[PDB]
RNA sequence: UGGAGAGUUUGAUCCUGGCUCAGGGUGAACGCUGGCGGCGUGCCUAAGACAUGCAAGUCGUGCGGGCCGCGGGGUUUUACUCCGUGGUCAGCGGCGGACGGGUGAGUAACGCGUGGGUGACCUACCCGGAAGAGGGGGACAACCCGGGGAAACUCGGGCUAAUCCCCCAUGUGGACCCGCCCCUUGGGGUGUGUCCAAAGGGCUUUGCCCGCUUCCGGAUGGGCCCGCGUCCCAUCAGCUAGUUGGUGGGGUAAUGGCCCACCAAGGCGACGACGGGUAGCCGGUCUGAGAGGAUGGCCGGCCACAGGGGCACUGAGACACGGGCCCCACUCCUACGGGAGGCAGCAGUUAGGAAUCUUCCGCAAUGGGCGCAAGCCUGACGGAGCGACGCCGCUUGGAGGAAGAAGCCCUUCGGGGUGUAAACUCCUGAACCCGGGACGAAACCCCCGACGAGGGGACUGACGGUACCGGGGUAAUAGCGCCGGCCAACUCCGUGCCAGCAGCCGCGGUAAUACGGAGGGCGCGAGCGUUACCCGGAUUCACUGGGCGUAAAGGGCGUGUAGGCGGCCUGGGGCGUCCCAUGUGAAAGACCACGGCUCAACCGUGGGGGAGCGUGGGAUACGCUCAGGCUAGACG
């Protein structure tokens, strides 16, 4: 079974490509707390069909390019910019801690 | 090693009359019938209250020197018993009693366990017909411990088995004196042994 | 090719063989595909040779090649008997 | 003071010269055909593409241009020729290309 | 079936807290000592440098020759030449040299582990299935001739064979462009067009055997891709130019920014990018009640490397340890022009080091390569050798033997101790001495049958005259540490804060159970100690399982970002959570049982396991999410 994840499109600034952020909950291996991790996957959008905020399913695919190994299966739900804003604020905080 | 050397000094040091020479530990010559104090220059001096480690070590040394088994084989047998399911102490005693030399002693073929060890090592004892010369051999229930047909003419065996006429054997052993053989019927229970040892003290000694 | 041969598993002066299906390019004691029997050359126990006949027939059907000793041991177990 | 496995080396050299030749032909012919397809000379283009495909398969007979890779070269050649003649038209000789 | 604590801060106490000890372990080393055997194990350092021998070849059933020799022919003789045959040598040709063997350098990475993907792939030999092999042509070695070089070797000319190379044909079929259909990433089918096949040899000789060609499938082996897991430093906070993406190409068996053109400006990062350091990873192993900590030697799996660096050729497969090329360092030859070489294969040498082995035997067994086979090769392997390095088994005697020799040590001078210990008495018989003497070895092969099934026959043992069996047969190595407390074991003398001891507390300055010796005792025993390292105790990095008023520890205070956490009620989803079924979890190891070496160590057979992850189905209390509602929190 080819892995099928579900995430949020947070970057449509590339050509025929979208950055889908995928979260996952799991108990900590030693401390048992259900912790939440995440990972960004570069998925293939050959029709520019999906835009920012779209929650979409992603499927393991034949490699399209270096770092691009997934295709957008279908659209789970339309643009919800709240998770996108959360990710953008997380990124924007990085400029405040340099020196 | 076998600790080879003086033995009735252990009859003295352990405070309990041991039977390491067979006879002469029953005769008024054991040096325990006449000198119950431990050996050495400081044997007759007033003893101090021994530590708990002292008590457990003395009890374990008593039980180990009764059989004449080295520390290596002793600890190995104890760990083997602790691995098994059941009471560690009674199983350990059943293991120690299952040694071929100890069975030869218990069957009255030899007067002492060390004499039995020499009888085994020199191939004078057979197990189920086949000759066995290993004191550490473990006898299973049902094994026939016999005397070699070529050794049944020896003077010492004649003496020992001529004295065994009329003597009873352990509840877990059978003896045929005419055929000079016997059978290990079962493992001995704790109630079958009259050893002056507290097994729980040895278990606690190795528990450290 | 895939072969049916013996592997040595006993100790020194105590040889014990596993009749085994493995790639010929692998070491004789290495990762085999399946153990299809065992063989004791010194005949220490009354059961000193056992072979899974159906499995040996399968591996011969798919294209395995046994050694001369392996083929002898299989023939003793009636792998090729068609009476 | 060495062993006669040097013989193998010798053989490789021969085979090397055998291979470089065939490929050097194939490549050459391919280019030639493509030229005629760019200039519209369809008859000669297909007539040379036939010989190119033949040399490709003959090289595939041995260890020179084995595997498919030969089918890959044939595919790319036929595709490029048919595409370049479509920029002009009139597939005159009707050679390797299907109707 | 599983969990022990103790010493030490004080005049005494309770606490906090560190240090230390008792335990187990090792690829160990060192000291003293040292008898036998079995099974294991043995460069952890310089991935430093290597003399020498061996370690990878094999096919005359693919092909033609050279040299040496014999036999038989054409001839009256000679010359010349033909056929058969033996030995030897390479050559051309095929297969193997990519396995096996070594090592841990480098690598923090799809390297490994684990579970998946390949509609994006390959696989020589092997197995099954379908079909085919017609005709013609050519070249290079060997060899003959000549040249260059000190050598390695090299150049030119000429003759020739083939399972060498090429052309045409046959098209079972396959390949490709295009179209259609099914299917859904490049899977499968179909039509026209085009393109592509082959090699012969051996006989028991017109019939089989070893092969050859095209195609489909199996099997095995592998390539690539993805989820999750994988050390330390944030006294490394920003990294990135093939960088991220696209289009079109090149390339490969195959995807890919792998590479290249052009276009877009992206990609990564406190959920730790980048940098630095360290390190093969795992099955496992050691320890631990467990959780966990530590580790990755032997054996098995995967990786990487072959003096350092780079690169392609050949091939089914290599970026090739014992193949090739170039640069660098090194060593050797050198006619100074130029060449040769690569133990981290076995053994051995040397250097370093506290420290790690034989320049051994064998092709008998198992396994591998070539061959129809015979057979050849195999420092893989099977064995032996050396080393108490480890584990296990065993010996240095057994029984009798004085109110108790001597010597030696204490002493109230009565005596006490070494101690049944000894000498002695009787008994067995380690060593050794003889004789017998293996299993491991029945296949390949040959004969019958049908080169099948089946039956029968014969050859072959390195270990080794070893194991084992029988007879004979001598009382015949014991050592090391400790004795103030923790911690089992006490006296005498000498010494006088001296000489020394010491793991921690501590002992010695005149009468030391602590130094040194003696007697005695305790503990282990062919060992005993020491040092080093790991876990343990240590609940002393506290998930299980700790703390912060005064013992180490609440930030000087606030505002607030991310993050963590979230009152009551109803419903949808089923992400966490839970359940069932199923796949996976190699073997070895671990556990249990039985069995084989007389036992054991060692080994064999069988049994049981197991988290995690994949898939299918189910549950909805809680956590999550979405939709709605409430007012007890909060705000107004
Ligand atoms: K846990
Ligand atoms: K930035
Ligand atoms: K105290
Ligand atoms: K020439
Ligand atoms: K056709
Ligand atoms: K090679
Ligand atoms: K036969
Ligand atoms: K005898
Ligand atoms: K005798
Ligand atoms: K002095
Ligand atoms: K002293
Ligand atoms: K403060
Ligand atoms: Mg999400
Ligand atoms: Mg876009
Ligand atoms: Mg692309
Ligand atoms: Mg028990
Ligand atoms: Mg237990
Ligand atoms: Mg392999
Ligand atoms: Mg049988
Ligand atoms: Mg069959
Ligand atoms: Mg060669
Ligand atoms: Mg060759
Ligand atoms: Mg050209
Ligand atoms: Mg190639
Ligand atoms: Mg229970
Ligand atoms: Mg319970
Ligand atoms: Mg303390
Ligand atoms: Mg104080
Ligand atoms: Mg004090
Ligand atoms: Mg005070
Ligand atoms: Mg220790
Ligand atoms: Mg220790
Ligand atoms: Mg010595
Ligand atoms: Mg040995
Ligand atoms: Mg060895
Ligand atoms: Mg090394
Ligand atoms: Mg190490
Ligand atoms: Mg042939
Ligand atoms: Mg002649
Ligand atoms: Mg004539
Ligand atoms: Mg003449
Ligand atoms: Mg010849
Ligand atoms: Mg030859
Ligand atoms: Mg040559
Ligand atoms: Mg290898
Ligand atoms: Mg690094
Ligand atoms: Mg890093
Ligand atoms: Mg993976
Ligand atoms: Mg990773
Ligand atoms: Mg995997
Ligand atoms: Mg082939
Ligand atoms: Mg076939
Ligand atoms: Mg010809
Ligand atoms: Mg010709
Ligand atoms: Mg010719
Ligand atoms: Mg000539
Ligand atoms: Mg020429
Ligand atoms: Mg056709
Ligand atoms: Mg043709
Ligand atoms: Mg050919
Ligand atoms: Mg031909
Ligand atoms: Mg014929
Ligand atoms: Mg790149
Ligand atoms: Mg591209
Ligand atoms: Mg492409
Ligand atoms: Mg290739
Ligand atoms: Mg980056
Ligand atoms: Mg993350
Ligand atoms: Mg390293
Ligand atoms: Mg345990
Ligand atoms: Mg553990
Ligand atoms: Mg690790
Ligand atoms: Mg390793
Ligand atoms: Mg390994
Ligand atoms: Mg080197
Ligand atoms: Mg190099
Ligand atoms: Mg290199
Ligand atoms: Mg090949
Ligand atoms: Mg390599
Ligand atoms: Mg190379
Ligand atoms: Mg070499
Ligand atoms: Mg060279
Ligand atoms: Mg030195
Ligand atoms: Mg060795
Ligand atoms: Mg030899
Ligand atoms: Mg062999
Ligand atoms: Mg063989
Ligand atoms: Mg070996
Ligand atoms: Mg021992
Ligand atoms: Mg005596
Ligand atoms: Mg005698
Ligand atoms: Mg036999
Ligand atoms: Mg043979
Ligand atoms: Mg015949
Ligand atoms: Mg037969
Ligand atoms: Mg012999
Ligand atoms: Mg004898
Ligand atoms: Mg004490
Ligand atoms: Mg001392
Ligand atoms: Mg220490
Ligand atoms: Mg004095
Ligand atoms: Mg004094
Ligand atoms: Mg003293
Ligand atoms: Mg002494
Ligand atoms: Mg030691
Ligand atoms: Mg410690
Ligand atoms: Mg802990
Ligand atoms: Mg604990
Ligand atoms: Mg600490
Ligand atoms: Mg806690
Ligand atoms: Mg605390
Ligand atoms: Mg405050
Ligand atoms: Mg938040
Ligand atoms: Mg918040
Ligand atoms: Mg709630
Ligand atoms: Mg929340
Ligand atoms: Mg609900
Ligand atoms: Mg669920
Ligand atoms: Mg297992
Ligand atoms: Mg364990
Ligand atoms: Mg047994
Ligand atoms: Mg299970
Ligand atoms: Mg499910
Ligand atoms: Mg429901
Ligand atoms: Mg609400
Ligand atoms: Mg208010
Ligand atoms: Zn006594």
Swiss-Prot record, chain A:
Superkingdom of the source species: Bacteria
Keyword Signal: no
PROSITE patterns according to UniProt: RIBOSOMAL_S17 (PS00056)
Observed effect of gene inactivation: Increased generation time and a temperature-sensitive phenotype.
Pfam families from the UniProt entry: Ribosomal_S17 (PF00366)
Entry keyword set: Ribonucleoprotein, Ribosomal protein, RNA-binding, rRNA-binding
GO cellular component: cytosolic small ribosomal subunit
Membrane-traversing stretches: none
CDD domains membership: Ribosomal_uS17
Keyword rRNA processing: no
Any GO BP annotation: translation
Recorded GO MF terms: rRNA binding; structural constituent of ribosome
Family: Belongs to the universal ribosomal protein uS17 family.
NCBIfam families found in the cross-reference section: PRK05610.1 (NF004123), uS17_bact (TIGR03635)
Subunit structure: Part of the 30S ribosomal subunit. Contacts protein S12.
Function: One of the primary rRNA binding proteins, it binds directly to 16S rRNA where it helps nucleate assembly of the platform and body of the 30S subunit by bringing together and stabilizing interactions between several different RNA helices. The combined cluster of proteins S8, S12 and S17 appears to hold together the shoulder and platform of the 30S subunit.
Protein name as it appears in the record: Small ribosomal subunit protein uS17
Originating species: Thermus thermophilus (strain ATCC 27634 / DSM 579 / HB8)
Swiss-Prot record, chain B:
Protein's UniProt name: Small ribosomal subunit protein uS4
GO annotation (BP), single: ribosomal small subunit biogenesis
Domain S4 RNA-binding per the UniProt entry, residue ranges: 98-160
Taxonomy, superkingdom: Bacteria
Keywords associated with the record: Metal-binding, Ribonucleoprotein, Ribosomal protein, RNA-binding, rRNA-binding, Zinc
Binding site for Zn(2+): 8, 11, 25, 30
Record flagged with keyword Transcription: no
Cofactor annotation comment: Binds 1 zinc ion per subunit. In a number of structures (e.g. 4Y4O, 5FDV) a 4Fe-4S cluster is seen in place of the zinc cofactor.
The protein's role, per its UniProt record: One of the primary rRNA binding proteins, it binds directly to 16S rRNA where it helps nucleate assembly of the body and platform of the 30S subunit. Binds mRNA in the 70S ribosome, positioning it for translation.
Signal sequence region: none
An example molecular function term from Gene Ontology annotations: structural constituent of ribosome
PANTHER family noted in UniProt: 30S 40S RIBOSOMAL PROTEIN, SMALL RIBOSOMAL SUBUNIT PROTEIN US4M
Organism annotation: Thermus thermophilus (strain ATCC 27634 / DSM 579 / HB8)
Cofactor(s) required for function per UniProt: Zn(2+); [4Fe-4S] cluster
GO cellular component: small ribosomal subunit
Entries under HAMAP family matching the protein: Ribosomal_uS4_B
InterPro entries for this protein: Ribosomal_uS4, Ribosomal_uS4_bac-type, Ribosomal_uS4_CS, Ribosomal_uS4_N, S4_RNA-bd, S4_RNA-bd_sf
PROSITE patterns xrefs: RIBOSOMAL_S4 (PS00632), S4 (PS50889)
Family to which this protein belongs: Belongs to the universal ribosomal protein uS4 family.
Gene of this entry: rpsD
One matching Pfam family: Ribosomal_S4
Subunit and partners: Part of the 30S ribosomal subunit. Contacts protein S5. The interaction surface between S4 and S5 is involved in control of translational fidelity.
Curated annotation (Swiss-Prot), chain C:
Keyword terms, alphabetized: Ribonucleoprotein, Ribosomal protein
GO cellular component: cytoplasm; small ribosomal subunit
One of the record's GO molecular function terms: structural constituent of ribosome
Cited Pfam families: Ribosomal_S16
Gene Ontology biological process terms, A to Z: translation
NCBIfam families: S16
Family annotation (PANTHER family): 30S RIBOSOMAL PROTEIN S16, SMALL RIBOSOMAL SUBUNIT PROTEIN BS16M
Family label: Belongs to the bacterial ribosomal protein bS16 family.
Function: Binds to the lower part of the body of the 30S subunit, where it stabilizes two of its domains.
Subunit structure: Part of the 30S ribosomal subunit.
The protein's name: Small ribosomal subunit protein bS16
Gene: rpsP
Curated annotation (Swiss-Prot), chain D:
GO cellular component, one term: small ribosomal subunit
Pfam families: Ribosomal_S20p
SUPFAM superfamilies: Ribosomal protein S20 (SSF46992)
GO biological process: translation
Superkingdom field: Bacteria
Chain intervals for the UniProt region annotation (Disordered): 1-25
Gene3D superfamilies (UniProt xref): Ribosomal protein S20 (1.20.58.110)
InterPro entries referenced in this protein's UniProt entry, alphabetically: Ribosomal_bS20 (IPR002583), Ribosomal_bS20_sf (IPR036510)
GO molecular function terms noted in the UniProt entry: small ribosomal subunit rRNA binding; structural constituent of ribosome
Keyword terms: Ribonucleoprotein, Ribosomal protein, RNA-binding, rRNA-binding
Function: One of the primary rRNA binding proteins, it binds directly to 16S rRNA where it nucleates assembly of the bottom of the body of the 30S subunit, by binding to several RNA helices of the 16S rRNA.
Family: Belongs to the bacterial ribosomal protein bS20 family.
Subunit text: Part of the 30S ribosomal subunit.
Protein name: Small ribosomal subunit protein bS20
Primary gene name: rpsT
């Amino acid at each position: 079974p080819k892995k099928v994840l579900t995430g949020v499109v947070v970057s449509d600034k590339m050509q025929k490509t979208v950055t889908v952020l995928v979260e996952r909950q799991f108990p900590h291996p030693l401390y048992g707390k259900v912790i939440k991790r995440s990972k960004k996957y570069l998925a293939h959008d050959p029709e520019e069909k999906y835009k920012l905020g779209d929650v979409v399913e992603i499927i393991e695919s034949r490699p399209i390019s270096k770092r691009k190994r997934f295709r957008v299966l279908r659209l789970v739900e339309s643009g919800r910019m709240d998770l996108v804003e959360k990710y953008l604020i997380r990124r924007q905080n990085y400029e405040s801690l340099s020196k | 090693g076998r600790y080879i050397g003086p033995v009735c000094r252990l009859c003295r040091r352990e405070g309990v009359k041991l039977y390491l020479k067979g006879e002469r530990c029953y005769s008024p010559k054991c040096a325990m019938e006449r000198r119950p104090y431990p050996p050495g220059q400081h044997g007759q001096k007033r003893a101090r209250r021994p530590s708990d480690y002292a008590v457990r070590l003395r009890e374990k040394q008593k039980l180990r020197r009764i059989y004449g088994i080295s520390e290596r084989q002793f600890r190995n047998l104890f760990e083997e018993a602790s691995k098994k399911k059941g009471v560690t102490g009674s199983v350990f005693l059943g293991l120690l009693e299952s040694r071929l030399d100890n069975v030869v002693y218990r069957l009255g073929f030899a007067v002492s366990r060390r004499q039995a060890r020499q009888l085994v090592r020199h191939g004078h004892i057979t197990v189920n017909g086949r000759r066995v010369d290993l004191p550490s051999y473990r006898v299973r229930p049902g094994d026939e411990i016999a005397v070699a047909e070529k050794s049944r003419n020896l003077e010492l065996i004649r003496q020992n088995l001529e004295a065994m006429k009329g003597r009873k054997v352990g509840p877990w052993l059978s003896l045929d004196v005419e055929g000079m053989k016997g059978k290990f019927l079962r493992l001995p229970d704790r109630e079958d042994l009259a050893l002056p040892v507290n097994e729980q003290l040895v278990i606690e000694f190795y528990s450290r | 090719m895939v072969k049916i041969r013996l592997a040595r598993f006993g100790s020194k002066h105590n040889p014990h063989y596993r009749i085994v299906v493995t790639d010929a390019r692998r070491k004789r004691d290495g990762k085999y595909i399946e153990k299809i029997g065992y063989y004791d050359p010194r005949k220490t126990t009354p059961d000193w040779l056992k072979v899974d006949v159906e499995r040996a027939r399968y591996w011969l059907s798919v294209g395995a090649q046994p050694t001369d000793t392996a083929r002898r041991l299989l023939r003793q177990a009636g792998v090729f008997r068609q009476e | 003071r060495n062993l006669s496995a040097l013989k193998r080396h010798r053989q490789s050299l021969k085979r090397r010269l055998r291979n470089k030749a065939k490929k050097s032909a194939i490549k050459t012919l391919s280019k030639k055909a493509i030229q005629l397809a760019q200039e519209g000379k369809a008859e000669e283009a297909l007539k040379i593409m036939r010989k190119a495909e033949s040399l490709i398969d003959k090289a595939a007979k041995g260890s020179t241009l084995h595997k498919n890779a030969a089918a890959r070269r044939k595919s790319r050649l036929m595709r490029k020729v048919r595409q370049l003649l479509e920029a002009a038209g009139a597939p005159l000789i009707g050679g390797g290309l299907s109707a």
